RNA sequence: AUACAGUGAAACUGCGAAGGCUCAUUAAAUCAGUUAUCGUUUAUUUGAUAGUUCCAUGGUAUAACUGUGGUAAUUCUAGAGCUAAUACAUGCUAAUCUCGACCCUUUGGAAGAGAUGUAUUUAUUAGAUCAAUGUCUUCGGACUCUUUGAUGAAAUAACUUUUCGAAUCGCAUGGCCUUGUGCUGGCGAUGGUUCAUUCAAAUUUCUGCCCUAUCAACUUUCGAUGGUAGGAUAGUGGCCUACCAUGGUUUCAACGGGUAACGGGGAAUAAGGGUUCGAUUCCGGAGAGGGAGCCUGAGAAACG
């Protein structure tokens, strides 16, 4: 990156002569790291005083949230098929926050057969994934700055809100 | 469209290389008689 | 290491359940014994020793929590549990008094309760061992003093282990052999009982299915067992009526009244606590006050009395006639009440009522005049239903007036009881009008005109529909009155109601008038009427800030010439609600 | 080396006995508050 | 390089103590230097105030303190040992730092001004105050810019000031910083010039904030004492 | 009322107060506007100061133009020359603001590049 | 809009006004006397310096009381005393003859603009010069 | 003073330097005050603030030091041999908290059931009622609509390569008899996690003295104007990028034109007669040969 400031750029009223000053230590754009799928490796950053900041690049062991029970299990990704804050970042297959990527729910399953007995009230088109095994999951957490893949399922109602759009 | 495909000449590159005259060891009726199919 | 262990907790899964119970055989063969105590008990145990039982246990639980579902379950591990918990009993009761290992093995046998519990929580009808009662008498000879152990509002070991027993359908066999229910109704007859009572009632009333369902006559007496003792808990669900969790006891009297009638004193204390169910507690929902109604009707259909339980089945179809919720369904409850009420007042009630509510018919106003020519001498649930006829029930206004017209006409012909029964009817008459009717107000002021049979004509030009002279001669007539509490609160409630933020109408200025001249001629009234002036004032200056304050202040402007009056006329009060109001008025002055 | 061993265990048991029951101390005042409130 | 506070004359250096860091901020406070050396003058140079902050004679608040630049702000009693000097330094009316002598039931304790109370962690209640003695637990009832009364002994609140219209007010900030009389007006405004309005001998009015006011006793009781002339 | 991906949604309908003598209409309160940056329910948290002028333009969503002319005592000149001023403020659920139509607005949270204040009322 | 601390409009100032002739006539017709010294301690350096002006000896009465008020004795600080001294005793031997000032009546400052002709008094109504007067 | 014991070259250590010259000309954007940050960082100042234990003390590997040397040579070196820790890094640790079946009446709690943290990043929700001085008194009560108040519009399911449950010291032999350091046992400084304050910084609301329309258009030509999401942030933020809408400022002075902008703006002290001389902070930002990239720290794009 390179800054946060309004003196390189116009404001509401449409100035000029700007040839202001050079960038202090508090303007500090770090490098975008985009995070992908390989093996865990955080790169731990200093900023203010011993403020550590986790910088994950190849993580993995995602932390998704059953919904409507609110489970959050250990699982592996997959990829993001869908992510309009860059569409060629879905066409490089990297993984940020509130990207819908897919899982294999095998420890959701175990957890369903565990504490209900039977494997099969939940809606078809994830009972179509509690079958197979792939299904569909959105990031909360921000491994550019928190480090972590943390995220929840997708159950019904926003299943079908991102199925219409892709 | 405004940052997009800005038409226009730049100045540090506008003699970056310089080119070559013979270029292509092959001749350009090699070409034609290359991929005539 | 706790860490570490609940991540091979949460990774102990991944192989089969040939593997698991291979895992768990290993565990069950740390300190099992089954050369020794599989017969009857132990021979030796140490602090140590049972440190690793604890550990054992602890392990059971973890197990047991990590695959909730099968748990790979082994009567290796079920003896090697046994020895376990025979073990911590032994050792706690059988050392001295110290406690320090005492209450390690406690906390060790508690735990090791808890993973036993955790063991039917997880695998309960899946394994269903046939050798049960080898455990169950072991438990039994172990907790036998846990009589009114188990009774709080947190005990739940054994409490929790006699509802997993009761709510399963073959493993009652150990309930059903000697005693569960005795010891667990001993408990739930405890007088000091917490709201774990009503999960033991729940848990005895989800259990006696399962008693009546089993073809063995040892269970039908146990399940005669648990009627009886639906009988002798008939202080326990009336107690512990605290919160709306009354569907179970709405559910048990349903149950009790199809399975079992047993005496007649029996149905009349079903009945009357059924009747306390609809007078003890208002925040009673629709469906279980119909049931709890229709199981008092179904236990009067049984043993119903001629007189006591007559005129308290009576009483509650006068209070379920005034309320007829739920679009007629506690109405035709309420009709099916009165028809098995089993008196004369009843007949006439469940005539009465049968012929008005012929499914949205003509018969309501023909049934009205029915009675009217024909008036019955009860009277009382007639009026009930002939009041709630009166009020924002829009059909039979004629047939309502008639209806106070001959209510009046039989409390002048009585000439007492009917007398209380006409103050019965201007407490009605009151909330009538001080509401947002239209034709209930209007037949609560033919109400009032057939109670006052120049008032009388003061009364009939008020309800005249003509608002401008006849507001003008309510304000003479107001003004001759000057020239009465209750009453006086009820002429301004009514004129109050028809200048009540009607701001679609001109006059409101003398309508406000009126109804300040109406409150200064009954705070002249000073012997009596000083509070109810008191009150009106009050009601008017809650108006003035409930969101509308047009014409509020007007009205505190005028009623505050009551007080220019008294102050006057005094040239002993209460100084300091009066200077707040002021700081109020104040403060609504800063707006 | 082991009187070290000594002092620590005392003055951490009564760290403990001060602490713990002071907090709880007043917090009991603060259930006296909520009473009177 | 002075500012108006201190009644620091002019004729006595070129570098002014800047105080450190503590309770109080450096606008609105005084360090011990300026308090001891060249205000009521029990030294007379930097070299003996450390002599005898090093022979720990202050004991400001109770506790001792031993520090030259330690910013002593409103109303913390500074407490002498010798000749039992007991001073509890309020504003006069034209901004400076007015040190009222008091006695030892008076400095017995002092009073805070609360700015907040929070649901912190745990289920706490808690009050903080210009000196910042966070103290656990008081009443419900505690809104901004009331008055606790501090135990100095130990920390509690032992007594508690309500502020509401009709009470005995102590301005401190903005152009009418340090005046006493607390009545013609009351004014709550939605985010400035909102406050309760101070008499004068003819009571005459002012403006002020609400952050820039607090309470100090009642109509004619304050169980401070005060100065006169 | 969803033209946009990513779960649009309030983030913990939701409904809370900012209080301060600022009413919350019924449907910031109960309906299906997700209120992200409207102060009722939104993220933010009121602060500040509090403004109050009629608008300019209100063409772009999300931005209400208000105009602000102020007296001002000048003793330059010794004539008041007329204030005017300007500043952009989020959408809330209670009134399509059109031109005239005197409201205030909160100080909070800088929103764009340039607003800080969000509408509270209309009158 | 809203207050701001200003020590320059609550401080004490009394010195823009301060005219030596008006302090003269006050001095004059003052009814109390008026600390003069004993008749040679006044003068400084054997008659090389003047004798000493009243200012001068005022302001030498406040250094001696500040001196022993805090047990300092003051300093010969180079840019203050470069200044101060030398212009001071300059325009002491102009304008000061025989303990006397006389630089003022060589000096243009209006009397009654600044000093006289009351401004917060001005009494710009007839019924309030009026009552001024009444 | 036969395991230490004073002087002390040269080495590790704690800190020191804790704020100094020149050069090109920025019109409330440099600056000053002020509003706010439940929108954020914080060493130091100050006030507060920790409950998971199955069959008598833990490991080699480096210095300084010796010894063999190289090179013209450095605060340049390399082999060989030892040796220590508050250096590195594995690891030893009593039972007390509520509800109280029972109470023997005061010396009152024995049985049973439920307990027990922090640091990181994920979701559901705890976050409408009852008490009278009075409606009717039938001198009893269903009482809230009236007359006043009150609880009230962090509890849990998981990750993390997780920090800890004192190898600090001082003052006081003091109490006990578990028959010997058996328990020591009282207090205070330094620790130690977290919060708040203070300090400082960054943003941000507004206010503040040249003439200017021969500067009437500017802004999308470093996004122009806003919305949605992500990245980066100490966080707010078109600060940057994807997508979308065509906006926004202006005759109520946009935007642009220069200097006695080596001068000005209170930036401040004022002086007992100097009336724009007469006290100072700051001209603008940079630079350590020249641009570029990186690193350190509570604070930096470091005078080292």
């Known amino acids: 990156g390179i800054s946060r400031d309004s003196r390189h750029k116009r404001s509401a009223t449409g100035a000029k002569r700007a040839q ?24 731990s950053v200093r900023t203010r005083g011993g403020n550590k900041k986790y910088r994950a690049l190849r993580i993995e062991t995602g932390n998704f949230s059953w919904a409507s029970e609110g489970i959050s299990k250990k699982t592996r990704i997959a990829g993001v098929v869908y992510h309009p804050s860059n569409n060629e970042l879905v066409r490089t297959n990297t993984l940020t926050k509130a990207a819908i990527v897919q899982i294999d729910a095998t420890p959701f399953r175990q957890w369903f057969e565990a504490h209900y007995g039977q494997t099969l009230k939940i809606e078809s088109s994830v009972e179509s994934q509690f079958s197979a095994g792939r299904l569909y999951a959105c990031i909360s957490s921000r491994p550019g700055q928190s480090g972590r893949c943390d995220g929840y399922i997708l159950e019904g109602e926003e299943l079908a809100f991102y199925l219409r759009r892709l | 469209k405004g940052r997009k495909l800005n038409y226009s000449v730049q100045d540090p590159i506008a003699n970056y290389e310089a080119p070559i005259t013979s270029g292509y060891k092959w001749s350009d009726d090699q070409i034609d008689e290359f991929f005539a199919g | 290491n706790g860490s570490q262990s609940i991540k091979a907790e949460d990774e102990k899964v991944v192989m089969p359940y040939v593997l698991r119970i291979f895992f768990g055989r290993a565990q069950v063969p740390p300190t099992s014994g089954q050369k020794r105590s599989r017969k009857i008990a132990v021979i030796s145990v140490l602090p140590n020793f049972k440190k690793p039982y604890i550990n054992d246990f602890l392990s059971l639980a973890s197990e047991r929590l990590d695959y909730n579902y099968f748990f790979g379950n082994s009567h290796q591990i079920n003896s090697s549990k046994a020895t376990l918990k025979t073990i911590r009993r032994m050792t706690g009761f059988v050392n001295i008094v110290n406690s320090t290992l005492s209450v390690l093995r406690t906390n060790f046998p508690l735990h090791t309760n808890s993973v036993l519990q955790p063991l039917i929580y997880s695998i309960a009808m899946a394994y269903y061992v046939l050798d049960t009662e080898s455990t169950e008498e072991v438990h039994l000879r172990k907790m036998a003093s846990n009589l009114r152990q188990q009774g709080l509002k947190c005990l739940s070991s054994v409490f929790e282990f006699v509802g997993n027993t009761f709510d399963w359908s073959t493993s009652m066999e150990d309930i059903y052999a000697v005693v569960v229910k005795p010891r667990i109704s001993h408990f739930s007859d405890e007088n000091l009982q917490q709201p774990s009572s009503l999960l033991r009632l729940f848990l005895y009333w989800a259990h006696n299915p399962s008693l009546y369902q089993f073809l063995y006559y040892d269970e039908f007496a146990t399940a005669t067992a648990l009627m009886d003792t639906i009988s002798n808990q008939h202080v326990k669900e009336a107690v512990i009526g605290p919160i709306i969790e009354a569907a179970d006891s709405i559910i048990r009297n349903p149950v009790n009244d199809d399975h079992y009638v047993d005496l007649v004193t029996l149905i009349c204390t079903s009945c009357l606590k059924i009747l306390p169910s609809l007078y003890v507690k208002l925040s009673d929902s629709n469906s279980i006050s119909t049931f709890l109604n229709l199981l008092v009707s179904i236990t009067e259909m049984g043993f119903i009395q001629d007189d006591h339980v007559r005129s308290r089945l009576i009483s509650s179809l006068i209070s379920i006639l005034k309320g007829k919720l739920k679009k007629l369904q506690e109405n035709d409850t309420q009709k099916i009440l009165k028809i098995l009420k ?11 009522d049968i012929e008005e509510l012929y499914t949205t018919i003509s018969s309501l106003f023909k049934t009205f005049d029915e009675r009217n020519l024909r008036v019955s001498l009860t009277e009382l649930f007639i009026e009930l239903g002939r009041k709630v006829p009166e009020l924002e029930s829009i059909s039979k206004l004629v047939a309502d007036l008639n209806s106070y017209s001959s209510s009046r006409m039989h409390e002048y012909d009585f000439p007492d009881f009917i007398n209380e029964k006409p103050n019965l009817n201007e407490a009605s008459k009151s909330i009538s009008m001080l509401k947002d009717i239209l034709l209930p107000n209007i037949r609560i002021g033919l109400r009032d005109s057939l109670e006052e049979v120049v008032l009388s004509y003061m009364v009939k030009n008020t309800k005249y529909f003509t608002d401008f002279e006849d507001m003008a001669i309510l304000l003479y007539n107001g003004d001759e009155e000057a020239d009465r509490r209750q009453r006086a609160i009820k002429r301004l409630g009514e004129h109050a109601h028809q200048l009540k933020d009607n701001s679609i109408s001109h006059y409101l200025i003398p309508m406000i008038e009126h109804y300040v001249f109406s409150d200064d001629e009954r705070y002249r009234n000073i012997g009596n009427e000083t509070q109810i002036a008191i009150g009106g004032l009050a009601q008017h200056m809650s108006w003035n800030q409930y969101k509308a304050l047009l014409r509020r202040y007007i009205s505190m402007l005028k009623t505050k010439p009551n007080q220019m009056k008294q102050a006057v006329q005094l040239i002993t009060l209460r100084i300091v609600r009066d200077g707040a109001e002021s700081k109020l008025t104040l403060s609504k002055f800063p707006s | 080396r082991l009187q070290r061993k000594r002092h620590q265990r005392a003055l951490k048991v009564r760290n403990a006995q001060a602490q713990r029951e002071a907090a709880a101390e007043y917090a009991q005042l603060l259930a006296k508050r909520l009473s009177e409130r | 390089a002075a500012p108006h506070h201190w009644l620091l004359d002019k004729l006595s250096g070129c570098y002014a103590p800047r105080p450190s860091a503590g309770p109080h901020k450096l606008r609105e406070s005084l360090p011990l230097i300026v308090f001891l050396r060249n205000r009521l003058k029990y030294a007379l140079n930097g070299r003996e105030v450390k002599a005898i902050l090093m022979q720990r004679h202050v004991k400001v608040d109770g506790k001792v303190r031993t520090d030259t630049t330690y ?8 407490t002498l040992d010798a ?9 006069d009316v034209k901004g400076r730092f007015a040190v009222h002598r008091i006695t030892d039931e008076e400095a017995s304790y002092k009073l805070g001004k609360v700015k907040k109370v929070q649901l912190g962690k745990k289920g706490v209640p808690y009050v903080v105050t210009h000196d910042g003695r966070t103290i656990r637990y008081p009443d419900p009832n505690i809104k901004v810019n009331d008055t606790v009364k501090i135990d100095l002994a130990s920390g509690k ?22 005046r006493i009389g607390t009545i013609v007006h009351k004014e709550r405004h939605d985010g400035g010039f909102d406050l309760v309005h101070i008499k004068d001998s003819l009571d005459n009015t002012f403006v002020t904030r609400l952050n820039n006011v607090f309470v100090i006793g009642e109509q004619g009781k304050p169980y401070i004492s005060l100065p006169k002339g | 009322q969803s033209e946009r991906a990513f779960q649009k949604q309030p983030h913990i309908r939701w409904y809370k107060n900012a209080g301060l003598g600022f009413k919350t209409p019924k449907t910031a309160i109960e309906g299906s506007y997700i209120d992200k940056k409207c102060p009722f329910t939104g993220l933010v948290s009121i602060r500040g100061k509090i403004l109050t002028g009629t608008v300019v333009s209100t063409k772009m969503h999300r931005t209400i133009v208000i105009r602000r002319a102020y007296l001002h005592y000048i003793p330059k000149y010794n004539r008041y020359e007329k204030r005017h001023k300007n500043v952009p403020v989020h959408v809330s659920p209670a009134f399509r603001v059109q031109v005239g139509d005197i409201v205030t607005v909160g100080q909070c949270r800088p929103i764009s590049k340039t607003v800080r204040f969000n509408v509270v009322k209309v009158s | 809009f809203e207050d701001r601390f200003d020590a320059r409009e609550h401080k004490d100032r009394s010195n823009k006004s301060r005219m030596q002739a008006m302090e003269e006539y006050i001095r004059e017709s003052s009814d109390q006397p008026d600390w003069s010294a004993s008749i040679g301690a006044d003068i400084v350096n054997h008659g090389r310096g003047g004798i000493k002006s009243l200012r001068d000896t005022e302001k030498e009465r406040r250094v001696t009381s500040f001196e022993e008020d805090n047990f300092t004795r003051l300093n010969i600080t180079n840019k203050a005393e470069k200044r101060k001294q030398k212009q001071r005793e300059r325009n002491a031997r102009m304008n000061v003859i025989g303990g006397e000032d006389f630089g003022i009546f060589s000096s243009k400052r209006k009397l009654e603009d600044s000093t006289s002709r009351r401004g917060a008094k001005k009494t710009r109504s007839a019924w309030d010069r009026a009552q001024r007067r009444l």
């Open chain 5, 71 to 78: 910013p002593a702000g409103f109303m913390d009693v500074i």
């Open chain 5, 83 to 91: 000749t039992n000097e007991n001073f509890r330094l309020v504003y």
């Open chain 1, 20 to 43: 202001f000053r050079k960038k202090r230590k508090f303007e500090l754009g770090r490098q975008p790291a985009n995070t992908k799928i390989g093996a865990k490796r955080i790169h």
């Open chain 5, 157 to 178: 609140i032992t007594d508690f000031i309500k502020f509401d219209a009709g009470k005995l007010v102590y301005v401190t900030g903005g152009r009418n910083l340090g």
């Open chain 3, 342 to 352: 089993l008196i004369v007042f009843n007949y006439n009630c469940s005539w009465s």
